[PDB]
Amino acid sequence: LRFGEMERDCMIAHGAASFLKERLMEASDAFRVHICGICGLMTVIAKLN
Amino acid sequence: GQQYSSAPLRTVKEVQFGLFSPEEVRAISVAKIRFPETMDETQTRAKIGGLNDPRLGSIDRNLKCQTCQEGMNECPGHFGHIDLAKPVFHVGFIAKIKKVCECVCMHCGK
Amino acid sequence: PNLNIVLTCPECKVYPPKIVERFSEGDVVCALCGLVLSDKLVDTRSEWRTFNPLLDGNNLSTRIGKGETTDMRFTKELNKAQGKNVMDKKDNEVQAAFAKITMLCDAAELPKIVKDCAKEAYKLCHDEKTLKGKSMESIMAASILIGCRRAEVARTFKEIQSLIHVKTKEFGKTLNIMKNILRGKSQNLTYIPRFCSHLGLPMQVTTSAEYTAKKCKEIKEIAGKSPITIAVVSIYLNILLFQIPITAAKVGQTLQVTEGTIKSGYKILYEHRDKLVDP
Amino acid sequence: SGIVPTLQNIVATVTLGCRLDLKTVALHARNAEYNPKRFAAVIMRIREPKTTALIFASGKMVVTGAKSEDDSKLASRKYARIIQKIGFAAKFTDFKIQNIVGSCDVKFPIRLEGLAFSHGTFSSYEPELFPGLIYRMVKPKIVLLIFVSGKIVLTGAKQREEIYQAFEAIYPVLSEFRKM
Amino acid sequence: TLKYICAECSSKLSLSRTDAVRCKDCGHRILLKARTKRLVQFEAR
Numbered sequence A: 001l002r003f004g005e006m007e008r009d010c011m012i013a014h015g016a017a018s019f020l021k022e023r024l025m026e027a028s029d030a031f032r033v034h035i036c037g038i039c040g041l042m043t044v045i046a047k048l049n
Numbered sequence B: 001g002q003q004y005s006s007a008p009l010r011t012v013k014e015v016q017f018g019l020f021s022p023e024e025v026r027a028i029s030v031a032k033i034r035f036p037e038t039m040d041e042t043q044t045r046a047k048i049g050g051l052n053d054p055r056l057g058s059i060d061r062n063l064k065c066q067t068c069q070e071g072m073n074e075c076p077g078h079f080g081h082i083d084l085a086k087p088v089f090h091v092g093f094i095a096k097i098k099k100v101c102e103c104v105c106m107h108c109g110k
Numbered sequence C: 001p002n003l004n005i006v007l008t009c010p011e012c013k014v015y016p017p018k019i020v021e022r023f024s025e026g027d028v029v030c031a032l033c034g035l036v037l038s039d040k041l042v043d044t045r046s047e048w049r050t051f052n053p054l055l056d057g058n059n060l061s062t063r064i065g066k067g068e069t070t071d072m073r074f075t076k077e078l079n080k081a082q083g084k085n086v087m088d089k090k091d092n093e094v095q096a097a098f099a100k101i102t103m104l105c106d107a108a109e110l111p112k113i114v115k116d117c118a119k120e121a122y123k124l125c126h127d128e129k130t131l132k133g134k135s136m137e138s139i140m141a142a143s144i145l146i147g148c149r150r151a152e153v154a155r156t157f158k159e160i161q162s163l164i165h166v167k168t169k170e171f172g173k174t175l176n177i178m179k180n181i182l183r184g185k186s187q188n189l190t191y192i193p194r195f196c197s198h199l200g201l202p203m204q205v206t207t208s209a210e211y212t213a214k215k216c217k218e219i220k221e222i223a224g225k226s227p228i229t230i231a232v233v234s235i236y237l238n239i240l241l242f243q244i245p246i247t248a249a250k251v252g253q254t255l256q257v258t259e260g261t262i263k264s265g266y267k268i269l270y271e272h273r274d275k276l277v278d279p
Numbered sequence D: 001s002g003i004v005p006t007l008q009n010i011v012a013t014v015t016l017g018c019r020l021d022l023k024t025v026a027l028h029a030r031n032a033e034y035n036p037k038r039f040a041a042v043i044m045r046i047r048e049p050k051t052t053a054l055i056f057a058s059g060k061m062v063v064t065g066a067k068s069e070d071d072s073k074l075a076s077r078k079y080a081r082i083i084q085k086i087g088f089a090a091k092f093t094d095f096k097i098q099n100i101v102g103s104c105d106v107k108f109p110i111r112l113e114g115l116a117f118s119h120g121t122f123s124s125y126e127p128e129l130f131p132g133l134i135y136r137m138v139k140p141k142i143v144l145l146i147f148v149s150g151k152i153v154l155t156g157a158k159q160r161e162e163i164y165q166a167f168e169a170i171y172p173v174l175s176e177f178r179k180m
Numbered sequence E: 001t002l003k004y005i006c007a008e009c010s011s012k013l014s015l016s017r018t019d020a021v022r023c024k025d026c027g028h029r030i031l032l033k034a035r036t037k038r039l040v041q042f043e044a045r
């Protein structure tokens, strides 16, 4: 189901900042990525193994 | 799920926009893209230096992105580059070029 | 490199593993312990739900034209900049082959499957010393006959000869090599019904001929030198078994056959009339 | 085998060594068919040995219809003698048979369908123009035409001997593919 | 092979795989599929 733009606003008016976050990252598509600390570009070649 | 890494986890505090220097592209790029072919010339895996070589990211949930490793759900995809034969306008800036040229001598640059 | 991924339950490990994909959960699970191996499965029908490499390969294409917001001093040059790289590609002779054969099989009133096999049968051979030109017809005249028969629809050489005049000879040599092209890369029944309809007959007259022609074929009577003829005689055999006016002269031109092969072919029939008695 | 490949035509080349006046060659002959509108070669049929030959402005003669190496050879020697009677010093020099085509029979009905189908790679068939199979051998390099009547048309050799060898090789195939 | 039924001729057919999809007695090209034999249970609720 869609968490629309207006649902986002209604959640802001409630002030529920954490739910707004969880509903937007945990509940949809979080993604860890690495970034260079100099050129802040997702260009790190992580061999995290 | 997602495998443990070690880089310290932070949160973004600032975005600095800004254009892209052609040197920067080349320094980033992992591959010189040359041949319009996608697949390998033998109807098999993929043309190296082709329009998606394996050194760019990979998909199929079955391969490893030989640049940075396996997970199709870890690799963010790595950028490759093409160097044009001759330079061209970037559509977003034609107006901001025509405007600019009208503000500087077209001979000395001042 | 080997660039390869395999899943296996690291806490059972017993196998090339026994795992199942629970799609509606986006999971793969060890069918033994139920450890979920990998998740966030990506859809597999919605992908093409929103929507030819066997021919068009890897050199891709895109139809470039004129939008609403362009004047003719930019539109026609898109028609004058697209023309600089049509000879580095032999693909004109690739596509204009298909376009031609598409223009052919379609004008020929043929099933769109044959169109593909001919869009194939060109593309597979597409240049050989055996080909070395040879009028570029005979292939599109045989690769169709290939594409036709290979698609289980058989048509006579004259029938295609009607579509394309191939001198009847450039056809023959081109066919032999072509067939052997695939053999290295590796059925006259079809004529009975198409003929009956050409005469506008009910099914039984055609129904019977399949028995008769097969039975006339099955025992003896090699009979015919291109059995096209000895097909029709079955109709003539069976039409006379019925009493419907398809008089010999009407048969001939309708099916473009010699009359002589009929009666002499019917000689072996006015004598063999013994064993075709089904009812 | 037990079957001799029976030659029906031998085509051979003979260098008479002179630029023959094909007009005078046609004029001084007894029954010779030469007019430039078909070929640049006088064609003569000699009944003994009965051979048909085309002799060009180069003086080179190609002979056909012979039933032997010696039929063609003796016919060509007679041809050179005829040319010399015409007036040109024809000579039998560097003769070579360029073709020996024969027809014989193995006489047992053949599963030609089996051969062609299983030897599609080697033999091709479109039985709606001509009912014969085409087969190839490199050692010896003989091409063989096969028909259900048992007729074997062996071609592709300067000698009847390659005909014989490939026939000794192909008759066993025929008996193997013998329909019954 | 399995039973079939012509759509119009309405004759049991029993063809197999790699037979023509075609009716005897009328070269009609539509066949039904000769309903199952195992019993089937409903509730009169």
Ligand SMILES: [Zn+2]
Binding pocket: A036, A037, A038, A039, A040, A041
């Ligand atoms: Zn950096």
Ligand SMILES: [Zn+2]
Binding pocket: B056, B057, B058, B064, B065, B066, B067, B068, B069, B074, B075, B076, B077, B078
């Ligand atoms: Zn990667």
Ligand SMILES: [Zn+2]
Binding pocket: B105, B106, B107, B108, B109, B110
């Ligand atoms: Zn200046």
Ligand SMILES: [Zn+2]
Binding pocket: C009, C010, C011, C012, C013, C030, C031, C032, C033, C034, C035
């Ligand atoms: Zn397990």
